[PDB]
């Protein structure tokens, strides 16, 4: 066989130990999901320092909690905007998931509250910036560098999928680098509790699995496809399927064809062909062996999955950090004033927030 007796016994034991972990993690998540947090701070508890990012729903700002001096990232969502953008259920769901999950590579929600006009999700500040910016800046990550990040996504998806959460919006834009060089997954606006199948067309074109594009009822294997896209993009500097317009990207994705840079190792290419596998019955992460097909793949032979989870691996890259409020790793955004209307907007729609 590929493993001798000591290796196989060690590997099987480790696999049962993570099953034991996930079982306990699932119980703690459900208990938190049934009894969630609410109204745990207020706006004047924070100084607003700088906008770190923007989106259709609102803005994310670096804030400083006045009492403690601690910095946080405060996501501000315009309620009326959220309605018009038909994002009520996503936003409520994201906040509900964020307060219920617990994993070292998932951003932690520290406070949440609302006022007449806005919803506020106060998350840990992740000062290293988006993986996106570093990837485009460096050009591409070495395979060990890409592997270090990929390993954390694998563990994170293993965790989320054990909670029956499909993530569905993996991309470097969504992955922040913390001070130790580890990954923080943010943005759960498309995550959903799915034990079986789900049908929503959602995600980012380059990262859509074929079965999403083809309007099938799909499952958590779309996350493993997206992992393949992420690994490819991290290691190549560009994603496997690109084109001027999303429709042409989709034609490439469903085509079953993928080309690799010549500098890709064969181990890497083998993993990618098994993740970027259009046939759901052959895609890694979707077979009887589950995530173990990925974690035991030759490309991950050097990965100490436990050490990664415990964050005992020295990161290949540590972002420039010049203090707790440093925003140098984030781009600059036009600053809009936070106006809290006198009239409560959309009170019914966000009652549970």
């Amino acid at each position: 066989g590929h493993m001798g007796n000591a290796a196989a016994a060690k590997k099987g034991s480790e696999q049962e130990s993570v099953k034991e972990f996930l079982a306990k993690a699932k119980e703690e998540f459900l208990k938190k999901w049934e009894s969630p947090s609410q109204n745990t701070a207020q706006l004047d508890h924070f100084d607003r320092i700088k906008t770190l990012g923007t989106g259709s729903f609102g803005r994310v700002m670096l804030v400083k909690h006045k009492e403690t001096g601690n910095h946080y990232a405060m996501k501000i969502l315009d309620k009326q905007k959220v309605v018009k953008l038909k994002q009520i259920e996503h936003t409520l769901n994201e906040k509900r998931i964020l307060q219920a999950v617990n994993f070292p590579f998932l951003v932690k929600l520290e406070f949440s509250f609302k006022d007449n006009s806005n919803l506020y999700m106060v998350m840990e500040y992740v000062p290293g910036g988006e993986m996106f910016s570093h990837l485009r800046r460096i050009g591409r990550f070495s395979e060990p560098h890409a592997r270090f990040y990929a390993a954390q996504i694998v563990l994170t998806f293993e965790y989320l999928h054990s909670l029956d959460l499909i993530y569905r919006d993996l991309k470097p834009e969504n992955l922040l680098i913390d001070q130790q060089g580890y990954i923080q997954v943010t943005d759960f606006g498309f995550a959903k509790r799915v034990k079986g199948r789900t049908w929503t067309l959602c995600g980012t074109p380059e990262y859509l699995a074929p079965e999403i594009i083809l309007s099938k009822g799909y499952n958590k294997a779309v996350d493993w496809w997206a992992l393949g896209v992420l690994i490819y993009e991290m290691a190549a500097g560009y994603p496997p399927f690109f084109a001027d317009q999303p429709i042409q990207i989709y034609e490439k994705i469903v085509s079953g064809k993928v080309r690799f840079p010549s500098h890709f190792s064969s181990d890497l290419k083998d993993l990618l062909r098994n993740l970027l596998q259009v046939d759901l019955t052959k895609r890694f992460g979707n077979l009887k062996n589950g995530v173990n097909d990925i974690k035991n793949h030759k490309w991950f032979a050097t990965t100490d999955w436990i050490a990664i989870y415990q964050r005992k691996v020295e990161a290949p890259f540590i972002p420039k950090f010049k203090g707790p409020g440093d925003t140098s790793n984030f781009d600059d955004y036009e600053e809009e004033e936070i106006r809290v209307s006198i009239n409560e907007k959309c009170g019914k729609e966000f009652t549970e927030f």
């Binding site: 259709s56 953008l85 959602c202 074109p205 500097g237 560009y238 084109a243």
Partner: peptide
């Protein structure tokens, strides 16, 4: 090159989810 095609695609910046 494939990288040049990636540049020519114009989708080198931050990518939005579909809407």
């Amino acid at each position: 090159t494939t990288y040049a095609d990636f540049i020519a695609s114009g989708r080198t910046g931050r990518r939005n989810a579909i809407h």
